[PDB]
Amino acid sequence: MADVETETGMIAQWIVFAIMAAAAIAFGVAVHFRPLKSAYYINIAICTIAATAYYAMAVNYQDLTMNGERQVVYARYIDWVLTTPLLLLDLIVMTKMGGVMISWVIGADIFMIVFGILGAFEDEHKFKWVYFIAGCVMQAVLTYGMYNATWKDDKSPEYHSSYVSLLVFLSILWVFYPVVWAFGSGSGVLSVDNEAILMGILDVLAKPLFGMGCLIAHETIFKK
Numbered sequence: 001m002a003d004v005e006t007e008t009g010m011i012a013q014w015i016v017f018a019i020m021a022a023a024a025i026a027f028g029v030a031v032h033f034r035p036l037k038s039a040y041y042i043n044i045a046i047c048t049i050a051a052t053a054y055y056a057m058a059v060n061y062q063d064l065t066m067n068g069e070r071q072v073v074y075a076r077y078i079d080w081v082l083t084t085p086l087l088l089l090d091l092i093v094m095t096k097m098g099g100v101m102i103s104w105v106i107g108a109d110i111f112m113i114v115f116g117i118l119g120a121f122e123d124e125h126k127f128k129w130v131y132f133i134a135g136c137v138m139q140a141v142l143t144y145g146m147y148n149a150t151w152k153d154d155k156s157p158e159y160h161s162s163y164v165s166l167l168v169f170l171s172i173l174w175v176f177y178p179v180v181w182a183f184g185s186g187s188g189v190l191s192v193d194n195e196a197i198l199m200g201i202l203d204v205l206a207k208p209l210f211g212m213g214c215l216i217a218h219e220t221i222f223k224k
């Protein structure tokens with residue numbers, strides 16, 4: 001039979017919705033009482049984006065577009081394509097990284113997503129996986145560069161530290177997405193719902209939580 005999202009998946013998403021929404025509102029207000037405002041904006045956008053994406057996924061878990069006999073909840077790629085770049089930025093600001101380099105990490109990132117999307121809608125397993133590799137290779141490149149701003153002597157010693165910190169956290173976490181993907185969206189061995197929940201779990205770690213980390217860090221440092 002076909003693997004399609006259910007009330008369950010819906011639930012999960014709906015839950016994520018609320019969280020995102022709150023963070024959005026939270027930061028959304030907070031910002032008006034700071035100096036520094038930018039860092040806030042970044043994360044406001046991020047969560048507002050997600051919130052929206054999840055909101056769509058949730059209300060339409062029934063309107064199924066399918067690759068094979070398994071529904072693909074693509075809205076997430078959109079989210080990701082927009083959010084992921086903003087997440088890297090959240091860290092980039094803690095560094096003195098050069099525009100030229102920024103564009104590279106970002107560009108890499110964007111493709112990482114698209115490849116995923118490409119694979120997500122591919123029939124031939126033969127290609128599906130090729131695409132998968134691609135993205136991983138992008139996540140790779142991308143990650144590599146992010147670390148050059150670690151050892152290569154280029155902001156303040158406080159920042160540098162916080163940066164390193166958050167990065168290792170983001171760096172590791174992210175590799176989970178591709179793993180989960182590979183499993184469901186990619187292989188099929190994973191349910192649409194479970195994938196949703198898993199992805200969902202990740203998102204909340206990757207976005208709201210990370211956000212706080214950053215905001216704090218900034219707020220913290222700024223106080224020095």
Ligand SMILES: CC(C)CCC[C@@H](C)[C@H]1CC[C@H]2[C@@H]3CC=C4C[C@@H](O)CC[C@]4(C)[C@H]3CC[C@]12C
Binds near residue numbers: 220
């Ligand atoms: C899950 C969602 C609802 C979480 C939202 C968390 C928001 C409300 C949190 C996370 C970061 C937090 C801020 C971190 C740093 C400061 C500077 C400090 O001098 C006063 C508190 C203040 C300004 C915090 C206000 C509350 C804050 C903005």
Ligand SMILES: CC(C)CCC[C@@H](C)[C@H]1CC[C@H]2[C@@H]3CC=C4C[C@@H](O)CC[C@]4(C)[C@H]3CC[C@]12C
Binds near residue numbers: 026
């Ligand atoms: C959707 C609901 C849950 C959102 C609730 C958002 C609340 C927690 C957010 C929105 C406005 C925010 C406050 C905005 C202004 C200030 C004064 C500042 O000097 C310290 C942070 C502080 C005190 C913020 C604390 C966190 C705060 C109260």
Ligand SMILES: *C/C=C(C)/C=C/C=C(C)/C=C/C1=C(C)CCCC1(C)C
Binds near residue numbers: 084133
């Ligand atoms: C808010 C969303 C976040 C932080 C999403 C992160 C997503 C990734 C790191 C995805 C990576 C993928 C690959 C490296 C290979 C192919 C499939 C993907 C798209 C899921």
